[PDB]
From a paper:
Here we report the single-particle cryo-electron microscopy structure of the native [name] ([name]-1) mechanosensory transduction complex isolated from [name]. The two-fold symmetric complex is composed of two copies each of the pore-forming [name]-1 subunit, the calcium-binding protein CALM-1 and the transmembrane inner ear protein TMIE. CALM-1 makes extensive contacts with the cytoplasmic face of the [name]-1 subunits, whereas the single-pass TMIE subunits reside on the periphery of the complex, poised like the handles of an accordion. Single-particle reconstructions and molecular dynamics simulations show how the mechanosensory transduction complex deforms the membrane bilayer and suggest crucial roles for lipid–protein interactions in the mechanism by which mechanical force is transduced to ion channel gating.
Two of these classes represent the [name]-1 complex in different conformational states, designated the ‘expanded’ (E) and ‘contracted’ (C) conformations, both of which exhibit an overall resolution of 3.1 Å. Because the E conformation has a few more distinct density features than the C conformation, we focus on the E conformation in our initial discussion of the overall structure. The [name]-1 subunits in the E and C conformations have a similar overall structure, both including closed ion channels. In the C conformation, however, the TM10 helix is bent approximately 9° compared with that in the E conformation, and there is one additional helical turn of TM10 in the E conformation. Upon successively superimposing the [name]-1 subunits from the C and E complexes, we observed that in the E state, each half of the [name]-1 complex, composed of [name]-1, CALM-1 and TMIE subunits, is rotated by around 8° compared with the C state, by way of an axis of rotation that is located near the [name]-1 H7 and H8 helices and oriented approximately parallel to the membrane. Indeed, in comparing the C and E states, the amphipathic [name]-1 H3 helices move farther apart by approximately 11 Å, thus underscoring the magnitude of the conformational change. Of note, the E and C conformations generate distinct membrane deformation patterns. In particular, the E conformation induces a more pronounced membrane distortion (thickening and thinning) close to the protein, resulting in a longer-range membrane deformation propagation (around 50 Å away from the protein). The putative ion-conduction pathway appears to be closed, with a narrow pore blocked by three constrictions. Examination of the equilibrated membrane structure around the [name]-1 complex indicates a deep penetration and anchoring of the amphipathic, paddle H3 helix into the cytosolic leaflet of the bilayer.
Author numbering:
A (entry chain D), B (entry chain F): 18 to 63
C (entry chain C), D (entry chain E): 18 to 201
E (entry chain A), F (entry chain B): 75 to 459, 664 to 886
The structure:
Amino acid sequence: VAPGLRLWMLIALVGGVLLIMIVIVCCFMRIRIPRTKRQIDLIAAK
Amino acid sequence: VAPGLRLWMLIALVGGVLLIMIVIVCCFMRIRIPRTKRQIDLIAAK
Amino acid sequence: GVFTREQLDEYQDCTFFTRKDIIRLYKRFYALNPHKVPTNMQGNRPAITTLTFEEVEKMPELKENPFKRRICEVFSEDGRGNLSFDDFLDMFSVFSEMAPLQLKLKYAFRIYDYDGDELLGHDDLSKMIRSLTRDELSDVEVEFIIERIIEEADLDGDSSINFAEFEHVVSRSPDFIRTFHIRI
Amino acid sequence: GVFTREQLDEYQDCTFFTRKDIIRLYKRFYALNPHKVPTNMQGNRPAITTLTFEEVEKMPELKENPFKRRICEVFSEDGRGNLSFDDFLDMFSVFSEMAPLQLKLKYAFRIYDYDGDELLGHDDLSKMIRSLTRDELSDVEVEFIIERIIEEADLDGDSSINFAEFEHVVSRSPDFIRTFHIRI
Amino acid sequence: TRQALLERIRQKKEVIGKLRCQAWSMTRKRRTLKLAQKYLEQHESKVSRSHLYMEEMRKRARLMKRSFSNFKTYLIPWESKIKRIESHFGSVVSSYFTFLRWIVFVNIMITLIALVFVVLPETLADSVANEGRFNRTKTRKQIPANERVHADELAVVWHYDGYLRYSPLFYGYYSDDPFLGNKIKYALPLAYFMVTLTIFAYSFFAILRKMAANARMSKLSGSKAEQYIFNWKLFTGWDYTIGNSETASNTVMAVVIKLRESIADIKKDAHGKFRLLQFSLRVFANIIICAMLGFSIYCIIFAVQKSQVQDDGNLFTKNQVPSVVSTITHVFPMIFDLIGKMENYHPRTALRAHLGRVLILYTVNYITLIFALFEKMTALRDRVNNDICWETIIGQEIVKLVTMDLIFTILSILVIDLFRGLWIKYCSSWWCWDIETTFPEYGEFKVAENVLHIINNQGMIWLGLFFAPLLPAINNIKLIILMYIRGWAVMTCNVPAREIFRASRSSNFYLGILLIWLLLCTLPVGFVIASMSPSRSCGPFARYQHFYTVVTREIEKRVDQTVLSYIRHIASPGVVIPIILFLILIIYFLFSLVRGLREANTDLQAQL
Amino acid sequence: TRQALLERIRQKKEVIGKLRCQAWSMTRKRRTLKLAQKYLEQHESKVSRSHLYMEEMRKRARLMKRSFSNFKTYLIPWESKIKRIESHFGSVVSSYFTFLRWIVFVNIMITLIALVFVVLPETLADSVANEGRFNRTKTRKQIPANERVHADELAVVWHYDGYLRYSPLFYGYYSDDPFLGNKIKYALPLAYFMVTLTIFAYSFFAILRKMAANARMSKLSGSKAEQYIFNWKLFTGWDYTIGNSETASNTVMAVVIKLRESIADIKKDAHGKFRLLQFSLRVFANIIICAMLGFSIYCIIFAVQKSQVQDDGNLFTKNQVPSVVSTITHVFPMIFDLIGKMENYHPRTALRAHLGRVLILYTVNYITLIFALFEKMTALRDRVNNDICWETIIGQEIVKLVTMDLIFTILSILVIDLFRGLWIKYCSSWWCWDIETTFPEYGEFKVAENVLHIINNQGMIWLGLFFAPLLPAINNIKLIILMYIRGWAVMTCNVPAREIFRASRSSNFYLGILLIWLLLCTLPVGFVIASMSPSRSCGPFARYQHFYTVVTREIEKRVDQTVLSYIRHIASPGVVIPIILFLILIIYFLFSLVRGLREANTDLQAQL
Ligand SMILES: CC(C)CCC[C@@H](C)[C@H]1CC[C@H]2[C@@H]3CC=C4C[C@@H](O)CC[C@]4(C)[C@H]3CC[C@]12C
Ligand SMILES: CC(C)CCC[C@@H](C)[C@H]1CC[C@H]2[C@@H]3CC=C4C[C@@H](O)CC[C@]4(C)[C@H]3CC[C@]12C
Ligand SMILES: *[C@@H]1O[C@H](CO)[C@@H](O)[C@H](O)[C@H]1NC(C)=O
Ligand SMILES: *[C@@H]1O[C@H](CO)[C@@H](O)[C@H](O)[C@H]1NC(C)=O
Ligand SMILES: CCCCCCCCCCCC
Ligand SMILES: CCCCCCCCCCCC
Ligand SMILES: [Ca+2]
Ligand SMILES: [Ca+2]
Ligand SMILES: [Ca+2]
Ligand SMILES: [Ca+2]
Ligand SMILES: [Ca+2]
Ligand SMILES: [Ca+2]
């Protein structure tokens, strides 16, 4: 509605629900970005 | 001379010279009033 | 009600574990082998339920320890090759953070020797070095290490370290309590 | 000018005594026997001027000491039965209040033994007890005392006290420096 | 008879107590327990009624303690998470998480202390406020209708103005009424002052108790330690917590390197070298560090000075003091690390120097910010003079600083750990240089830097809790978010360090830094309480000329004037200075005792 | 080359320095000295000019130190007297005389400090005083012609009135002129204040230096001592100083008794006994001691209060406060001793209890007298208000107290030692009971009581030297008289004690008591300087509203006002209290460290 008195609530709500979904999703999976030294050595050799 | 204004100087001077004589005399002799335990035992036995 | 009130009472007096810790340890023991661990163990059942050394060594806590076999042997009962629930409890209560420094020192000394003559000789120290290092040191390197260890940690000139000398030396290290610890 | 500048310089470097103390000690040494002590002693004369043990023991400082003979023997030179001016200076500089605790401990240990084997055995301690006490203790009493002394002041189980153990034991007594002191 | 009974009871009690701390088998322990129980049962009919009552009370106390412990272990959170972090990364990384959990517990206790006696009674009084109290507190508990329209503007809210300024979070919200109401007679200003003092007292007590438990009851024998290099690097060379294969291999390599370097150092024992280039680099680095410290001081002072407006002249520039300080707090350390590359030496002393520089920077920024804030508030109060509320303003600055610090910590975690790790993973094949095998790498957990972050935040909380009663309540949420995000970052993005060192290798190192920070933070609160005068239009102390007057006015109401005049004279400077001299003298005596004991121990070790 | 030369120089220097402390023969020492000298001569042409200059300067410093020591040993008195006392009575009796000689030296140094900068410049200015200065100082340096007739009356003189009141001995004699005169420009009030501060600073420094020399440099290894009963009672069982036959026999008997009682105690090891009569006697004695302490307080307060006159109303009653306090100080100890007979136990703890009671009595009398004197001066100043000179009055009270203390000490020495000894010698044959073989005896030297007398007198001197600049100058004569009379009394009347014990068996016991007394005496001087206001008609501080104003007025004349206002805020109570807390915290840390070191040492001793 309002550009300076209502837009920020909408943006904050969108960000909050997106962050809640991201946190819930990331609480059910076990990402491991780095690779082990064995994989690094294998890549370097090849 | 004076009873309350000069007698005390005379008494103090007499005492001072007497004390000086006593100190000088007692600085030239080696009085030892107590007696040894051997003398005490000898007196007690006799 | 896997354990009665008196069983948990005795466990709490003997060990450093509360009822929740005892239940969690029992759950882990059952998970190690559901078939060999009876669900109901009221009475003298814990003293008679045993698991093989390999099965206990399969757990993640002891999987990567170089001295896993030594720990299992030290904390086992008179039976050889078998570990009971009571021995399991004793092992994971000794390693706890609530255990005192003296108990940890005693059991660390008992672990670090192999023959079992209450003395840390040249052979035992060499075995420990080749186990911890994974044979990544030269023979001269290793021998120099045991030479230093024996010469700087001996008071009777016996070329062997007794329990008293071991405690006096390694109880002043600030990293023994931090390292000699297994969370469970 | 009994002593030259260099003689007093050497005396001050070696001992804890200033020129006034050296002069006073020389005066006392001359007073011990005017005939045997030359008035002029420039050069090597102090090393060759000697007095008998009894004459030195006649002085009031050492007259009532039970260990006067032991002190004279310990501080004497290779000559037996004779004490020189240099040995006299060494003796009365060791006993001074300016001497350090280590020197006093070394010379006290050297005094307290009799055979001269750097060890305080049962016989030496018994002799010291019968000298200090003046044979006013029963044989059982004396033996009990040496038993206590040897058992509570021995680390190698040799039944004898070496210099290191003697120093470690009696250097923590607050009355050693206070007592082991002769003013002159 | 009686003596034998006492000896038997003492022996049984000692055996039962020591049963757990004994290196015995379980069967032997159970046999000893049954034997002791049977002996006690036999000896029960040996003593009189008083001994039986004493034994019964002791047994009841022991049983109640055991039951309380059993209940307490059900309320300890983050055990599986800390266990996983320990097993994957080691027992030195998890020390930070255990420290953070203890800090969370302490902050929760402080929150309860400040919430039971201050926030809750005031809120209850507000709920039942009559016409008189409503009229008396409208000027401080109701937002004016002129400003109420602008209560939410993404800038009024972000600056804790509007509805937040008239909330129980700030000092100016509380009323001046001596009594909350009838049938209760609760003194709110006295509760405020006593709660502020009690929070600091409890913080001191908790830190000291933790230090004593960690040192006196655990490592009291560690004093006067020497040599034992190979013994300490071999007998304590394996972390039993580690349960990962890669971490185990890293530990094996680290212990091999440690032994090899120790032997290499002990072999040659030759140290001869002098290069002018290295000395020039070292002095240049130590000079640019001081230049950057001065630049940080100048930036903090400039940022505080530029925020010279109290009215809503502008807000995109007034918020530059939280964005600047936080920036330094989060950006200067890494730059320091880079400078540490120029000064190449032993990694342990390099870490110690880095910690010293970071601590000096933090303390300098703290002092500069405190001085600038106090000077600005004094100048603004003098210029404006109803009267402004400087306590609410200071609380707002502290709260904004804490919020910006949390935001910057989240941003730094996202950038350094997540995005850098993804960039390394997906861009190491075709980069100009091999980033994976070069300086960039994936990232290591900086235990000391993060612990210093925690200590700095706690110092801010301690400093600002007098002006903002609900600051610890917000800090609880901040600490929980910090714990969760740090756990996720270390688990997902970081790799185990190839060789991790310690600044002091002591349990009470970070606790000692925390105690020093607590003293540093209680200095300005004490100055404010003793010297500054409360505002006349806000807060609970608006009726007094001093903050402590609420306490003295009650002390003087129960103590005679003559004895009061007699006790006031002990506070004289000429009596206080000899007390300082006496304390210095006993400190010197204890230091001489410590030096003598150390010398005696060294001499005994050398001789034997 | 250079390293070898440095090693050779260091070895030669170490050998030459350690040559004296080596248990070598004289011939070996001389041979080593000649070898070292030859080696140094050979190595002279090995180094450059800088090393030669350094060696030359070191040699010059050593030679000058040796020459200064040689000159210094010619100015040490009372060596033959102390040697005779040591040889006749032992090395524990002569400790009092060595302590007294050191106290005399310290008092002489204090006298020189207070005489070079205060008394001498003022006297020189008075000698050359012009008409203006004479007019300005007539009211304080000239006795009025009304009172000049009564200047000597055996009561005006005995009370230090008349000519003594207008003498450099008292505070009111000194003038208010900021400068003594032309071409000198000597500030007398500043010199007065700085000399008063410097005397206390030097006293602290001297006591601490003596303590460090006695403990740190001599008995640093005595810490953490245990058992060694027979070793300590046999290897240190003979006093080498003793050179008398009777004293030697007494020492032999004492060592025999010591060994016998030690063995008897170690044999039975049985302690079972409970008599109601002994407990009743002990509690009764401990009650009458407290009753006598309260009676002493009441007597001191009554004596001070009765001296409520400032004009010459009467003088035979005004002099009752020096005659009462001294009486207690000299009569209560012996009564205490008699009470110690009722409380029969271990002689060592009996001596310790007696020392504790005497110290408590002395401190209580000190505090009561100070409080009563200050209250009386305040009341008199309020009643009388040119203005009176309370500083001169306080100085007069202190000087009269010291003089009466000396008189009472002389009387007690004459009565207890001389007359009692003569009575025993000439009246033991036909007395009712054998006094020679009973409690009366001849008399033993009380080392602790006499040392406490010395410490109490020195405390009075420290307290009263601000109001009486020439108090230490008189105390020098008092101490010399005391030394001579005590030596004569111990030589002529006393007999060696059959068995003499020590309260603490520590070198720094009496020095520690002296330091505690110095702090206790600097408390009220500090209060006077910080709080009380100078008189407007006497002294050098009559132009200021405070005693310290002469210092601050000069500090403010060289320091800007802004920085001054900034530094004054550190003196705030809210900043001072955290400093006290920090000092208490570091004291706690050092105490915990000491306890841990002691526990570790005990555990190591028990294990090995
Ligand atoms: C650790 C906890 C218990 C500390 C809480 C702070 C304490 C010291 C504070 C909070 C509430 C306060 C009380 C609140 C109300 C009253 C009634 C008033 O007529 C007298 C003071 C009195 C009795 C206060 C005394 C101090 C007090 C008890
Ligand atoms: C241990 C000794 C040296 C301490 C003696 C006290 C010292 C601190 C006192 C005594 C004499 C004093 C000086 C006397 C005269 C002057 C001249 C005046 O225009 C400025 C102060 C000055 C320079 C004084 C400074 C302080 C002073 C030096
Ligand atoms: C509250 O204050 C207002 C001020 O105008 C007054 O009119 C009203 O009567 C007051 N009501 C009360 C006393 O609660
Ligand atoms: C001293 O003071 C007197 C006071 O009457 C005065 O008459 C005289 O002139 C003064 N002389 C000086 C200034 O020395
Ligand atoms: C990983 C364990 C999660 C369960 C514990 C959650 C507790 C969160 C709040 C803790 C502080 C009150
Ligand atoms: C017995 C020795 C007498 C010689 C020394 C006398 C010195 C008296 C004055 C000492 C203080 C200045
Ligand atoms: Ca073995
Ligand atoms: Ca061994
Ligand atoms: Ca022998
Ligand atoms: Ca031996
Ligand atoms: Ca943070
Ligand atoms: Ca006296």
